[PDB]
Amino acid sequence: TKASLATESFISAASFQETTRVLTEAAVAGKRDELRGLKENVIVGRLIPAGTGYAYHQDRMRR
Amino acid sequence: ETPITANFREGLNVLQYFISTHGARKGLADTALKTANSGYLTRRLVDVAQD
C-alpha cells in the first residue's frame, strides 16, 4: 500500500490511493505522464500494452 | 468443561445445541467478513504489481 504510491504515472495512483493528495502533489510537481503500463491506459480507454495490443504498442513505443 | 455426547443421528438436547450455536456464529461471521477483507487484499495486491 506504500509501494503502490511510488508509481510515476499518477493516474493509477489516483485510481487507487487517496485521490486528493495524489493530484495535488503531481500537480505542484508539474508531473507529465506518458501513460506507460496498463491501468492508466484503461482509464484513458485505449489498447492495453500487454495482450494483443502489445504488438501494436511495440510498434508505437519503438516509433 | 463438558463436551457434547450426541450425534446428529441421535437427538441433541438444549444445552448442547446452545453451546454449538457459539461456534456456528463465530465461524459464519468469520466467513462473511473475511471474504470482504480478502477482496480488499486482492485489490491491494493488483494495485501494487499490475503494471
Partner: peptide, 24 residues
C-alpha cells in the same frame, strides 16, 4: 491469533508489535 491477516501484515511490510534486533 489471526489466520488470514497473517498474510496482509506480512505483505504490508508491517513490523511485528515487538521486534527483534539484528547486529550490523
Amino acid at each position: 491469533t489471526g489466520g488470514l491477516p497473517r498474510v496482509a501484515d506480512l505483505f504490508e511490510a508491517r513490523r511485528p508489535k515487538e521486534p527483534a534486533i539484528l547486529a550490523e
